[PDB]
């Protein structure tokens, strides 16, 4: 099935060239496809790729297009001013610029499907937009179309949307093919996917990525598979995990570390629109920041995340509260049970429920997964789906009955409506892991818990320590254990501010030594320093040479094992930038050894500045490549809310970097 027509090799340089004379006499029937490689690293603020219009007088308002913007989103229009037709269709951050110096070659496959009413749009094997109309309009049947134009659109005999760039290739197709026949066009892709929609998390949406190099070469990640659009709250999110064995080149489907059955997974396609994309699910118990680390001595990996219960609310919700009591120096997770109006109940030694007003227990007790037994039998509840077919989100009893967890809305009992912190463990390097188990609270049985720093933990060399960051207001609080994970202790670190997201991520300068970067609301990236494994900690300074945003965005950072230009290396992934999370940046520091500073020598720019960069994990590969899993969107932007496949991986050399 051949193209009608094939052109390659135009370079647009803010002239468009007309290829009428080629394409229109052999544009027939009412569905085509577009196939087009383009390279733009220095693209217009708003450019078209490909133009077929009505040039005349008056008609300046038939046209198709297919265009982009700096920011790195793709659309098409269609319009036809007789017709009383005006589509847009886009969607945020769907592209490449560069990519180790070089421009990418992005593959973008425009399938329009008169038989389905359908235009769906592909860029580098991802698909950005699918859309269905009422009522149809084929891109070659507009009113007077004269014009097939690359690098602008002919509006009225001017150039609109004039175009810096290239098509290396490009190919038109009198059929709307298949979405099979569409995966096997070849591309030139810099990244991979890890985990992306449709695969066995079935969440359509992921965010804070983590990354680590165990011991045995494998390399683990794990992330938020989130099904609620990309919400952080109120959601559906679990915890997946995916390794590699072959340094990154492929990944193992993903399974769960962390999972609640209360809410089905479903991969769902949330909508985009200003009236409905603060949709969120409500009802639905979910983890979130999730965070690795390996422990030399039992061999085993630890995982942290974040818990919610279905309950939880944004402030009010619960400040105040641990969600523990303390009787005797002992914690104690506390229950309200369906009917009561205060926790008078508290999961003693042994899961068995006590009822705190008259010390005597019940015949309830909580098991390992956190599940409600009554005199040792499993009780259950009815699991929820989520649907739109209403115009509106509905969460909805389905059917299927699911062990009720304390966690759950419809749960005879339920713990405090707080965060807490969940540990997991696998003893086969992430090809299972166990149940988790809550973390005690640290700041007092008054305080709620802290905010897991999402990513790595810290696995000192020298010793068997284990540290994970964590925050709170006013200070970030470390997790620190010499025993394999089964008992922790707090090392808490004044930090200047108030309420803030301070995302700490660690690096061990030298055997004992250790350097923490986090987030701030300066607009600077802040550190710190400990000297004696983390039982201490220094007054906080900031980074000069990297700029982020007044709120904020995640920061990774990594120890490299070889010295560049003679020196001790760290590495920092991070957007640089003021205004948005964009112009990603891998940042080489060199250690001085006369006190321990670090001189940022070298930037490696991602991608283009204007491309979106938010959360990121690294990790040196057993190689010595970086491997580098991050957010390839503004995850902060209220435009670019639940996009599917923009979380992305890719691998580089050091050389590269400098
Ligand atoms: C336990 O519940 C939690 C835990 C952490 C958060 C913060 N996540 C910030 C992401 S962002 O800066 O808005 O992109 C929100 C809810």
């Not at 790195?72 to 490449?96: C, H, M, T």
């Not at 523990?324 to 899961?351: A, M, P, S």
Request: with cysteine; proline share 3%; glycine share 8%.
């Amino acid at each position: 099935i051949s193209p009608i027509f094939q052109g390659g090799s135009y370079q647009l340089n803010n002239k468009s060239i007309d290829i009428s004379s080629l394409l229109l006499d052999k544009l027939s029937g009412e569905s085509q496809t577009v196939v087009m490689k383009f390279k733009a690293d220095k693209p217009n603020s708003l450019q078209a790729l490909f133009g077929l219009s009505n040039s005349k007088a008056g008609f300046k308002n038939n046209y198709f297009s297919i265009f982009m913007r700096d920011s790195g989103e793709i659309g098409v229009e269609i319009r036809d001013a007789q017709k009383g037709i005006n589509y847009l269709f886009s969607r945020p951050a769907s592209l490449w610029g560069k990519h180790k110096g070089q421009a990418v070659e992005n593959t973008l496959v425009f399938v329009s499907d008169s038989k389905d009413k359908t235009y769906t749009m592909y860029v580098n094997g991802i698909e950005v937009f699918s859309e269905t109309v009422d009522t149809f309009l084929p891109i070659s049947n507009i009113n007077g179309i004269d014009k097939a134009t690359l690098g602008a659109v002919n509006r009225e005999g001017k150039e609109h949307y004039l175009a810096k760039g290239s098509i290396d290739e490009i190919s038109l197709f009198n059929k709307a093919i298949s979405d099979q026949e569409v995966s096997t066009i070849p591309l030139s892709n810099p990244f991979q996917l890890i985990f992306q929609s449709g695969d066995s998390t079935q969440a359509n949406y992921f965010r804070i990525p983590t990354l680590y190099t165990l011991s045995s070469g494998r390399v683990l990640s794990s992330i938020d598979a989130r099904y609620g659009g990309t919400h952080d709250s109120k959601s559906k999110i679990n915890i997946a995990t995916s390794y590699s064995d072959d340094n990154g080149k492929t990944w193992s489907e993903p399974i769960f570390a962390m999972k609640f059955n209360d809410y089905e997974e479903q991969l769902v396609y949330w909508p985009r629109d200003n009236k409905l994309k603060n949709s969120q699910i409500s009802g639905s118990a979910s983890f979130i920041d999730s965070s690795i680390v390996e422990d030399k001595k039992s061999g085993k990996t630890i995982l942290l995340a974040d818990v919610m219960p279905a309950g939880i609310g944004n402030n009010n919700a619960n400040k105040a509260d641990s969600g523990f009591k303390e009787i005797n120096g002992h914690y104690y997770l506390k229950l309200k049970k369906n009917g009561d109006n205060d926790f008078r109940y508290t999961v003693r030694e042994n899961g068995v429920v006590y009822n705190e007003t008259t010390n005597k227990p019940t015949n309830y007790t909580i098991n390992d997964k956190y599940e409600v037994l009554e005199g040792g039998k499993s009780l259950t509840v009815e699991q929820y789906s989520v649907d739109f077919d209403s115009g509106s989100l509905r969460e909805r009893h389905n059917g299927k009955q699911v062990p009720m967890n304390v966690f759950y809305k419809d749960s005879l009992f339920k713990v405090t409506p707080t965060n807490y912190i969940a540990m997991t463990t696998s003893q086969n390097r992430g090809e299972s892991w166990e149940q988790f188990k809550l973390l005690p609270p640290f700041l007092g049985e008054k305080h709620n818990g802290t905010y897991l720093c999402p990513g790595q933990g810290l696995a000192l060399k020298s010793s068997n320590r284990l540290i994970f960051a964590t925050y709170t207001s006013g200070e970030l609080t470390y997790l620190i254990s010499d025993d394999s994970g089964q008992t922790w202790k707090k090392s808490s670190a004044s930090i200047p501010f108030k309420n803030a997201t301070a995302e700490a991520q660690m690096v061990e300068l030298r055997d004992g030594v250790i350097r923490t970067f986090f987030r701030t609301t300066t607009g600077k990236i802040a550190y710190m320093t400990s000297r004696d494994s983390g039982e201490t900690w220094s007054k906080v300074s900031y980074i000069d040479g990297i700029q982020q945003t007044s709120y904020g965005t995640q920061v990774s950072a990594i120890k490299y094992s070889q010295l560049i230009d003679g020196k001790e290396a760290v590495i920092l992934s991070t957007p640089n930038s003021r205004s948005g999370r964009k112009g990603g940046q891998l940042v080489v520091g060199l250690v001085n050894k006369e006190d321990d500073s670090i001189d940022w020598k070298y930037h490696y720019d991602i991608d283009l500045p204007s491309y979106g960069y938010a959360y990121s994990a690294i990790t040196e590969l057993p190689n010595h490549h970086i491997g580098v899993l991050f957010e390839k969107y503004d995850s902060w932007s209220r435009n670019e809310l639940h996009l599917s496949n923009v979380v992305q991986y890719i691998d580089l050399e050091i050389n590269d970097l400098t």
